[PDB]
Symmetry: C4
Subunit: 339 residues, 4 copies
């Protein structure tokens, strides 16, 4: 009708002439204008992904973790404190549009938090916009990420409110049912391209949040203009993630649920389930890092800015999708970076 | 060849700036120019969906039930009389193009019915047009819904026949095999927005009938210009629905069949199937989930009213790959969700 | 260009003054051959012989006897049909050395229509075939297949063919598009050939890929004078072969004429299909479906169907909406699955 | 975003007028200007696909096999020698970009190799262009194939580097995960078609490598303009391939793995997977079916030669439903088909 939007599986990157080996690329990126990460990875702010244990591991990996707000204000400030009490580690906290929102900001700021994430289901709303201005009035130097959005117009209005960064993604999450119960959402790839274009026109970087399943998907997001990528599912199985280990018919599992699921709220827009135990975060990141560098090797990109400036996309069909994945083969040895 | 028509699964709505919250929006819709609903929901006129018990619950919930015509004229009048006697409640009655069509209409009008619906497989037929013209000639004050159509040309013809509202949908039904056995039909979303646009010019509202699986599908149908959504499958497993609770493999199910199926025809070539649907419980609990999802969508599009929703709605087309990520993926769902399965 | 098959498209409802019990299914197969209903059984060694061809003509269609037998045997099969009242009968010939001997035999048996069935109808061998036959028998009705292009219609109509069979690859037992990579999606194929055929006053037969009665309507609306089917009639008692039981279920062997078994590099497969029972009740569901379809388009005649037919394309999501969904079917419909 | 790119399964070939029978067509092709093959088939340079046993079988069958480089320099030169001394047989040898690459080239040339393949994940790079130049400057008469690429620009750079032949394919391999872990690649048919077109302007042939499952897939590649087709999956299950015949549940299998898999590389990040495929018996039977399938295709398009096949070939695009129609459907296949599974 208006246009057809695409997600990550609809698209492929086209190989460019390369004069750079995968081990020669640099994954440095600017999260906000005052905060630089060594790798463009962020762990999701959920009660089953990121607490003290995960945030410390991520920051030590060159990324950053966002402490979830599904706890008391006192507890969250203590979680942030733990991360800051172990070296100069970057740490983020989650803030929501509520009645005690400023009291919550006051606590984590005193806990010396680096970045604040103001995430609601609908970022392009009166609550979020006025909320950002209200936070930027008391703490002008505090770095603020707002979300989530899916349109260029939302990027502009959030920038006007004083946001330093915006989170992009309405519906792509593996645990998300927003597009099903509300019928609302924009396919993540198109959403990232449209928002990053407007973002680079105003000087405000964007974050690709949700829908990422493979390392190659991250390369598509980074080549679409995203300054960083947020994942829950990929990190939820890691040992650094909250929750106990469950054994189900010989295999090991970890629980994983959306912040809009029934259990987390204790009308839902998320589900609740389990994912396979992956082990330590370091091993997951290694395969992710290696895959991205390999991708940037194919495109001749030494940095992430060169990746974006010289990336060409092509659309693939259902048949092309089957060709991209391994096919007509009975896999006997599982790979660390696939399935 | 002519064009590409889309269904609900094909599209998604784009979020607008929002200065409203889901608990602040109004769901009041306008069925006909005289009949107003509090929520744009109505139960399908099917022998396994809407009887007096269901029609009562639908009305008290803010919507309206439509009594099916698979029974004697005397019995259908009694079903309506049961609904209207228990409080001042809205009620609908189904009429078909038959020989005793007018006498069936005569009976339900005597039972103080609010709206008549001339539902048939092919609404854009001579029998319906001449049929509506007779009902409107005898009862000029009686509100008439006529279906089913799928093209704007049929909207012009039925409205010209005197209809007050039209019902859209040929094929979308969960129990429907019309598109398979006849090869005839139009994907419901394209069908709805085509007819609603034409009906908007003539001032005749349209009804999105069939094909709605989740609460988000309704939001799409309302944004496409429909004034109300008709559903059979969603309500079929509810307590207020006709039929006994049958147990299959230790789970509770109710029988749900098509009006054009083999079983329904025997009651009084098939274009429907017969099957079972899980028992969902009381209607209020199912309506609550539907309303909540609809109010969320209107919160996302920043629309306080159903009209404003239609005025500022932007659809985007997703592929089968986009359909995958739109649903939950890469996770073993263990806990149960009230609005997803 | 992207070409479509039957499941890609849907017919759009028109204004209707006619009812399904009033329509007419009379069609003109050739110029001087007409059927009461536009259905014909495939000339396959597991579908059509005298018993099937007799049943087909009695219902109002016509069956074509397969050529996978001796010239004497196929001549007897035709006679067995012709003896059983004034019943229509068809016979298939191929581009062979004794093709003229086979033609002479079935003509002597007073067959009504002949069909040259080749994998590639648009070839030198088939054009010579039609032209050589029409020289000896200017009054013998000839169908020629298979083709998929309008150019092929022209070249075949100019050879003296009375009708052309359309379909390369849609067959349920076919692997041509897989082993050769050649073919055209049947709907676009019939639609393109039908338009060219109307210009020349030559009818086209939609052959292969027909699963439901709605699919048959789509072909007729595209401009096909008739529809040929193997799979829908394969499991019937009137079809050749014996009933084989496999793990409790009664099946009949159905196989492509280009499979290893029928040849005794294949372009067909050999499989089993469920026992459907008598042909009469299958036809009753097909005819009634086609009637329903025509009623939706306000078409009293087949030629009126084609003139006012408007197609529309659906996605794979619209496909899942067209079939019955989100319900556990407990009773098998007589015309669906 | 650019145009949409297609896979073999996305398209079909339109039949042409034909005066030729499949038994009359010729399958001769020029792999390079100096090298001619009786049949346009190649085996992949992989440790689970091609060694002297396979190369000899491929050669005797009219094609050529490329010895892989997962062995020492003395071992590979030894394998090449076995093929050359067995009879007047063609043989290829695979080379990678390393410090000992010129030493390895010297060895296989001394073994009288016919063609060198510079195999790498990304042929369009500084390393490969320098390699082709460094080799050609020392061995001007030696035939050099370069890959892998997927763009016409890469063709020009390789041709300008001195390459005699270009291998295309980024990610279509059956055991490949490059498009999944790097998100990089081009659907093979579009790649082959683009690279062949640029090749025709320059006068340099292109190989279609990977993603071929059926004989009909090969025909599309050849019609797109490729000079030959390189296959791993189709050949790896044969007896002449390396690796023992493994058994599982009364069914005999063989091990087939990608050269970028964890097992073949022997921390690292893999771009391939290891698995198992069915035992197909002898290569002679497999080749016979592939040849027969191509001869059939050429007869459909009225093409007596491969060059005549490319010139009058018309492609059409099919949807998902067309894909279902193209394959066998609604039938329980009982007997085994020698060219379909
Ligand atoms: O709050 C939720 C659902 N929800 C979630 C959640 C979080 C992330 C993604 C999806 N849903 N978490 C919740 C926790 C409690 C209650 C409702 C919740 N959804 C909406 C929907 C429309 C809105 C319009 C304007 C302003 C806010 C709106 C909020
Ligand atoms: O004859 C068959 C295969 N075949 C079939 C068959 C029939 C219909 C559809 C597909 N295949 N039946 C056969 C019976 C015996 C031997 C081969 C057969 N295939 C071909 C393929 C290309 C041709 C090009 C020019 C002239 C004739 C050509 C024939
Ligand atoms: O009557 C039914 C089938 N049918 C149904 C039904 C109702 C809704 C959706 C699908 N089918 N209910 C029936 C009850 C009795 C007999 C037939 C019935 N279908 C048709 C089909 C084409 C028509 C064309 C012109 C006029 C009327 C036509 C009717
Ligand atoms: O070589 C591999 C991975 N790899 C493979 C392999 C072979 C064929 C297809 C895919 N991958 N085989 C390997 C063997 C050892 C180590 C890495 C290997 N990956 C890449 C990816 C992008 C590059 C860009 C410029 C230069 C070199 C690049 C290398
Ligand atoms: O329950 C919810 N409903 C919808 N989206 C959610 C919910 N919980 C988390 N998300 C989003 O999904 C992202 C992670 O999804 P995933 O990594 O693709 O599994 C988070 O960073 C949030 O943006
Ligand atoms: O048997 C039938 N054949 C075709 N459509 C039907 C039949 N019975 C009911 N319908 C339609 O399908 C609607 C309900 O389908 P659902 O709510 O989408 O499951 C009804 O309101 C009718 O419009
Ligand atoms: O072996 C074969 N290979 C390819 N096509 C075949 C073969 N046998 C029959 N056909 C075609 O397929 C049609 C029937 O297919 P179906 O109706 O789709 O089952 C026949 O009328 C022939 O046109
Ligand atoms: O591990 C790998 N990763 C990616 N591609 C590979 C790998 N190993 C082999 N290939 C390619 O895949 C081709 C064979 O794929 P197939 O014929 O589709 O099985 C080879 O000729 C190589 O071009």
């Amino acid at each position: 009708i208006l246009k057809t939007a695409y997600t990550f599986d609809d698209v492929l990157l086209v190989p460019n002439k390369s004069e750079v080996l995968p081990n020669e690329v640099s994954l440095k990126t600017q999260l906000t204008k005052k905060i630089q990460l060594n790798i463009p990875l962020m762990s999701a702010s959920m009660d089953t992904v990121t607490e003290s244990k995960m945030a410390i591991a991520m920051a030590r990996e060159g990324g950053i973790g966002i402490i979830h707000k599904n706890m008391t204000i006192e507890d969250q400030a203590r979680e942030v404190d733990r991360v800051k009490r172990s070296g100069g580690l970057l740490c983020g906290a989650s803030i929501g549009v509520t009645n005690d929102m400023m009291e919550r900001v006051d606590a984590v700021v005193k806990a010396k938090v680096d970045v604040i994430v103001l995430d609601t289901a609908h970022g392009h709303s009166k609550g979020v916009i006025e909320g950002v201005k209200r936070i930027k009035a008391k703490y002008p130097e505090l770095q603020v990420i707002a979300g989530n959005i899916a349109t260029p117009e939302a990027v502009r209005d959030l920038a006007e409110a004083g946001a330093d960064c915006v989170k992009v993604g309405i519906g792509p999450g593996s645990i998300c049912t927003t597009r099903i119960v509300a019928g609302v959402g924009v396919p993540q790839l198109t959403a990232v391209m449209d928002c990053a274009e407007e973002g680079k026109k105003l000087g405000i970087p964007v974050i690709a949040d949700g829908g990422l399943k493979y390392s190659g998907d991250i390369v598509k997001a980074l080549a679409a203009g995203a300054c960083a990528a947020m994942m829950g599912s990929i990190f939820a199985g890691c040992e650094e993630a909250p929750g106990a280990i469950e054994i189900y018919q010989g295999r090991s599992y970890k629980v994983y649920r959306g912040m809009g699921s029934l259990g987390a709220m204790a009308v839902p827009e998320g589900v609740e389930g389990r994912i396979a135990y992956k082990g330590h975060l370091a091993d997951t990141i290694y395969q992710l890092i290696g895959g991205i560098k390999s991708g940037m090797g194919y495109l001749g990109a030494p940095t992430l800015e060169n990746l974006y400036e010289n990336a060409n996309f092509v659309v693939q069909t259902s048949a092309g999708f089957r060709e991209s994945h391994p096919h007509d083969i009975n896999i006997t040895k599982e790979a660390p970076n696939y399935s």
